[PDB]
Design a protein around this ligand. Sequence first.
Ligand SMILES: Nc1nc2c(ncn2[C@@H]2O[C@H](COP(=O)(O)OP(=O)(O)O)[C@@H](O)[C@H]2O)c(=O)[nH]1
Ligand SMILES: Nc1nc2c(ncn2[C@@H]2O[C@H](COP(=O)(O)OP(=O)(O)O)[C@@H](O)[C@H]2O)c(=O)[nH]1
Ligand SMILES: [Fe+3]
Ligand SMILES: [Fe+3]
Ligand SMILES: [Fe+3]
Ligand SMILES: [Fe+3]
Ligand SMILES: [Mg+2]
Ligand SMILES: [Mg+2]
Ligand SMILES: [Mg+2]
Ligand SMILES: [Mg+2]
Lengths: 195, 195
Amino acid sequence: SYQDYINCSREALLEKMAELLPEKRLTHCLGVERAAMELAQRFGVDVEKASLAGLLHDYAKKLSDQEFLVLIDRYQLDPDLKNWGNNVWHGMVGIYKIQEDLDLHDSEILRAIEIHTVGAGQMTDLDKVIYVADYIEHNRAFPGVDVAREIASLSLNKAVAYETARTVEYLAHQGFPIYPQTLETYNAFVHYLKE
Amino acid sequence: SYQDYINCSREALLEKMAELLPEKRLTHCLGVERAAMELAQRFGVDVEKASLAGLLHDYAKKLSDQEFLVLIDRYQLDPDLKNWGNNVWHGMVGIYKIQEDLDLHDSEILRAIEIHTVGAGQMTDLDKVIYVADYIEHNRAFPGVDVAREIASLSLNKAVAYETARTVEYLAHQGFPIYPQTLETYNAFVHYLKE
Ligand SMILES: Nc1nc2c(ncn2[C@@H]2O[C@H](COP(=O)(O)OP(=O)(O)O)[C@@H](O)[C@H]2O)c(=O)[nH]1
Ligand SMILES: Nc1nc2c(ncn2[C@@H]2O[C@H](COP(=O)(O)OP(=O)(O)O)[C@@H](O)[C@H]2O)c(=O)[nH]1
Ligand SMILES: [Fe+3]
Ligand SMILES: [Fe+3]
Ligand SMILES: [Fe+3]
Ligand SMILES: [Fe+3]
Ligand SMILES: [Mg+2]
Ligand SMILES: [Mg+2]
Ligand SMILES: [Mg+2]
Ligand SMILES: [Mg+2]
């Protein structure tokens, strides 16, 4: 059960999240919970750790900038983090709010949430499952989500590769700054697109 | 005259380059020489340093992988350079071959050639002129070269921004590794696209 990792039941958690997140965002988290379970079954990852990390991954999506800045100071995180914003913060810094609220201390689950947006050069299979689940969950409708879904049915690594390449491409298309850890993921995984 | 910086005349240099480079590549270098002069006039850069750096920028385009690897060892350059290829090497490492052949020691000209492909987070106006001249020279015909030309008529910084964003975008589109210094340039300049 989820209470093996956090300080409340799944139902209690959903009630809490429903007050923290807009409906669309909670529906997304439920989609990621389901997609993570499916991916974990396929690729040999603990389904429960995957489901819980999937449900929790966007728990901190709505924290204020000021809240994130307070957390960076309090936990003495990389000071360069203050040069970024919610996109980087909600996973990389938001894990500390999840930990405070829910008594989440499992290192694997925390790491998977931490890097769910940007990835890393080295990712555990759990990390990859969350990173991909987030992108392919049933409620997502962006062009090429179908390609991502097909790839994810066959290869976890290639699915990470596809997502990271499409993300870097779109960030540059839009003219948005690219977090250096995002590039680390990109350069580590892009070769799988030849797979 | 060019002999103020190198060990031969412009005519002698062209004769040498014609044996080192395919016709198309030498024509490109001549295009960059001209474009660099125009940009330097517009943006307050020494026209002669610009023209010479423009002509020379792709001098090392055709060196073998083995030649580049020898230069990396000989000059004890960043050992990470061995993980890359001609795209990174021809400017970043090729400057040493230019220096050996032509007795080029001018630090400003060398730096502008060095970073002409990838840029840097901090670029001199000469660096920017070469970086942009390369992209917009008259022989270039790629989609959106017209946009780059228009921007370059107005703002050197915005032209760097446009080129770097389009390059990162295309590298991710194609699935090619992105050199970390390229990202440094991208993150430093992308804000100018709001200009
Ligand atoms: N500026 C910036 N945004 C990024 C980067 N990587 C991902 N993002 C964006 O962060 C946003 C949230 O991403 P993610 O956490 O994966 O999905 P979500 O929380 O379900 O929307 C998206 O718009 C991504 O494109 C980056 O390196 N830089
Ligand atoms: N793999 C890779 N290629 C790059 C990077 N930056 C630029 N290039 C490519 O290097 C090639 C040569 O670039 P450049 O020196 O600017 O132009 P050229 O020498 O006149 O063709 C082009 O195909 C660029 O897209 C990078 O970060 N990684
Ligand atoms: Fe997220
Ligand atoms: Fe999400
Ligand atoms: Fe070049
Ligand atoms: Fe060139
Ligand atoms: Mg994040
Ligand atoms: Mg993250
Ligand atoms: Mg180069
Ligand atoms: Mg270069």
